[PDB]
């Protein structure tokens with residue numbers, strides 16, 4: 215298996231690493247039908263989403279999508295620095311594939 | 318693919334944005350049958366609920382409804398200020414569709 | 421829907437409101453068979469339970485039962501003041517139907 | 524229903540109350556196959572387990588076992604003092620049936 | 627059952643105990659398809675994973691794998707010192723079977 219977020223990110227097409235090195239600026243969560251999602255933004259001006267579960271997802275990602283939203287919320291509430299995000303850039307806003315935190 | 322809570326909220330009928338910019342004053346939770354819900358209030362006097370899950374909800378909303386109630390509880394306990402709420406105004410108290418928070 | 425704990429409590433028979441206005445003194449949790457329950461006590465001497473899930477509950481209460489024990493646990497740990505409890509008084513100790521907290 | 528951990532522990536044979544009055548010294552968690560369990564220790568030298576889910580447990584205990592592991596972890600991390608444990612003494616290490624915390 | 631992580635770790639082949647005695651330096655989480663995993667690193671240069679769920683896992687490990695990832699996230703966020711890690715050394719990064727922490 216991969217040893218870092220960049221190596222893992224490099225296995226997927228349509229992705230890029232954003233080096234954030236900052237805590238989350240805003241956290242938005244929706245339970246509106248067909249828009250069950252989370253959106254985060256940074257002072258840098260970037261906006262990112264955890265996509266609504268769909269047909270591009272495989273069954274093993276169900277729990278992982280929910281785990282990623284949980285992580286973003288607690289990270290926001292604890293003011294924890296995000297290091298990097300591995301995102302899919304074929305979506306707007308860019309879609310989170312993975313996150314890393316350090317220190 | 319909305320990038321803000323206002324863009325998201327505008328995709329639905331019977332919704333309006335409330336700019337709360339304040340922490341939750343009170344948190345109420347019920348496990349009584351047919352009233353499995355959460356009620357929150359603010360010092361402005363405005364009251365909101367997360368609705369009891371029902372026929373108006375699609376199955377993709379089930380985990381999202383549970384997530385929203387989780388978020389309100391930790392938000393209340395941490396004194397986290399809420400920025401905006403997107404709420405369905407055809408229910409009393411108005412019903413939360415989305416929440417945002419910024420730091 | 422109800423807008424307050426007292427209005428919601430009043431929809432049910434054999435219930436009453438206890439205005440606690442205090443933090444939980446003690447928290448007990450059991451995973452023993454047929455005693456899968458939580459008991460809270462207050463400095464006042466009053467004791468309440470979240471009952472073991474049984475034939476009196478409906479399917480929609482299953483997750484709400486688990487949420488109320490989740491809430492009491494984090495309320496205890498954070499030493500958060502409870503405002504009111506809506507309880508059924510046809511059980512001993514009285515059984516929790518709803519809780520409210522205010523800051 | 525029982526009103527205290529000692530009353531509830533008394534409803535079962537092969538149990539005893541250990542009075543702890545202390546925070547957990549060590550927390551151990553395993554996801555190894557057939558050893559999915561948690562072991563806690565105290566500076567007294569006393570050691571307890573949450574057993575691996577199995578044939579000795581009825582269905583209503585499955586979510587309660589997972590809740591006990593969650594309470595041990597958050598209690599460990601917050602340094603919360605444990606009051607009492609009700610344990611089965613026909614297991615080594617003794618097996619947790621219930622826990623209480625006070626103040 | 628086992629009373630310590632070393633006992634437990636010794637029941638399996640292809641394992642070893644790493645004495646960490648340190649907080650987690652970095653936490654990485656991926657919801658990317660086929661890489662639904664967590665990776666952690668230490669200032670020692672060691673890197674460990676919670677493997678993606680696969681054919682090597684039995685059903686009882688499903689919830690425990692999700693629990694271990696929950697534990698690594700809250701351990702990271704709180705800067706809780708890990709004592710030991712029991713890992714399978716037939717995977718890269720080495721794969722976590724159990725963790726211990728002491729206060």
Ligand SMILES: O=C(NCc1ccccc1)c1cccc(O[C@H]2O[C@H](CO)[C@H](O)[C@H](O)[C@H]2O)c1
Pocket residue numbers: 225226227228265270271272275302304305309658659660
């Ligand atoms: O590139 C992919 N896989 C590469 C891979 C597979 C196996 C091993 C290693 C690498 C891959 C596979 C399935 C879907 C996929 O990507 C798609 O779905 C994603 C969510 O899962 C995002 O929504 C992306 O925007 C969408 O393009 C990307």
Ligand SMILES: O=C(NCc1ccccc1)c1cccc(O[C@H]2O[C@H](CO)[C@H](O)[C@H](O)[C@H]2O)c1
Pocket residue numbers: 246247248249328329330331368373374375378405407408412
């Ligand atoms: O307006 C809606 N959808 C627009 C839409 C459709 C598809 C994608 C994005 C937006 C829509 C769809 C189903 C129900 C709905 O609204 C209804 O259900 C809500 C809970 O989900 C609330 O309880 C509202 O009070 C109730 O009026 C509103």
Ligand SMILES: O=C(NCc1ccccc1)c1cccc(O[C@H]2O[C@H](CO)[C@H](O)[C@H](O)[C@H]2O)c1
Pocket residue numbers: 349350351352431432433434471476477481508510511515
């Ligand atoms: O009084 C009730 N309902 C009024 C009501 C029904 C539906 C919607 C709103 C209000 C009602 C319905 C079913 C059980 C009930 O009460 C029963 O179950 C409770 C737990 O749910 C407690 O265990 C009470 O001790 C037991 O009497 C009380």
Ligand SMILES: O=C(NCc1ccccc1)c1cccc(O[C@H]2O[C@H](CO)[C@H](O)[C@H](O)[C@H]2O)c1
Pocket residue numbers: 452453534535536537574579580581584611613614618
């Ligand atoms: O004593 C029990 N129930 C109380 C009771 C039973 C029967 C009559 C009266 C009271 C009881 C029931 C089922 C199992 C039980 O105990 C068993 O399983 C426990 C976990 O559930 C532990 O693993 C104990 O070590 C094991 O002996 C103890």
Ligand SMILES: O=C(NCc1ccccc1)c1cccc(O[C@H]2O[C@H](CO)[C@H](O)[C@H](O)[C@H]2O)c1
Pocket residue numbers: 555556557558637638639640677682683684687714716717721
């Ligand atoms: O050696 C094993 N078990 C010994 C054992 C059995 C019963 C009780 C206690 C110990 C054992 C059993 C099943 C799988 C196993 O190991 C395998 O799966 C692991 C995850 O479960 C890791 O992925 C290891 O890398 C892979 O070899 C190792």
